[PDB]
Nucleic acid binder design. Structure first.
Ligand SMILES: [Mg+2]
Ligand SMILES: [Mg+2]
Ligand SMILES: [Mg+2]
Ligand code: NA
Lengths: 152, 152
DNA sequence: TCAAAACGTCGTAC
DNA sequence: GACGTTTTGA
DNA sequence: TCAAAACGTCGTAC
DNA sequence: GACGTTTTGA
């Protein structure tokens, strides 16, 4: 796992606290044992005319990709291992999004265990609730309650 | 002149590039010799529920203030001397807003001479045009062209 | 006559 | 910014 | 059954 | 985020 430079992390942390997102999702999906996917995403959003900025992020992070949705574009990192490595290093410098970052870390490390028991899986969905609670969440639909209602 | 930590400036630069604004305005105002005020503003916006972040900033920058504006709040720095001192030190770390930062500095250093001649005043106004051209400017009204007419 | 503050509005870029 | 639904390709 | 990508919309918080 | 109009107080 690559070691990121501190100056880079410091600036990136600031910019993430401003225009980034640390996202956790429970995605209803019939092909999973517990009928839901656990989905983590690190994202940085910027007007497409400045997507060169996001393209640099890819070079500097060395992983992830940029997707253009129209007037706006996103840097995206969803790969679990690279995500853990990156957040572990960024986390210390976050001020607005530190708890979310850490909750993500906690979730990733427990995934293996969440696969085993419906209970441990339900607990983990709770951590996702905390992430969403900390964020400026407005259009969320699938929660730990949703999972509890399905595991029956 | 108060001298800021690099760790501080690096994180703040990222956050500014994200959620900050470097604003230059020509404010129509009859009480001025050229019938407009030159206004410089450094601004950071954030949901009012995260005020404390902005309030911390005031302590850390040691100058400026926070204004709650309903559901959103703002850190503001308008005083010219601290603004020059702060921007001079922040500028090396901005990626998105570095050019307007340098333009603000130039304007500040020229203000005195700009008050002497309408021609120099006009030129300075063209630099504020440049700052607005760099920003995601959408509702601008007063430009150097409008100053130009008035001085006629 | 000026620097600075007070207060308000708009259209996205998050 | 922070979600959503559905598809891919193991 | 899964990790990850593809693709889309909502409601502000810039 | 990035403007706008109007007021304060030396
Ligand atoms: Mg923000
Ligand atoms: Mg931004
Ligand atoms: Mg923003
Ligand atoms: Na904006």
């Amino acid at each position: 796992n690559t070691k990121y430079n501190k100056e880079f992390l410091l600036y990136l942390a600031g910019f993430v606290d401003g225009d980034g997102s640390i996202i956790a999702q429970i995605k209803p999906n019939q092909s999973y044992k517990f009928k839901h996917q656990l989905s983590l995403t690190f994202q940085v959003t910027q007007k497409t005319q400045r997507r060169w900025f996001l393209d640099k992020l890819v070079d500097e992070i060395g992983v992830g990709y940029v997707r253009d949705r129209g007037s706006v574009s996103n840097y995206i990192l969803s790969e679990i291992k690279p995500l853990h490595n990156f957040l572990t290093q960024l986390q210390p410098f976050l001020k607005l999004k530190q708890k979310q970052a850490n909750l993500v870390l906690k979730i990733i490390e427990q995934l293996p265990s969440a696969k085993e028991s419906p209970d441990k899986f339900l607990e983990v969905c709770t951590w996702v609730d905390q992430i969403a609670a900390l964020n400026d969440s407005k259009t969320r639909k699938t929660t730990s309650e949703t999972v509890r209602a399905v595991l029956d």
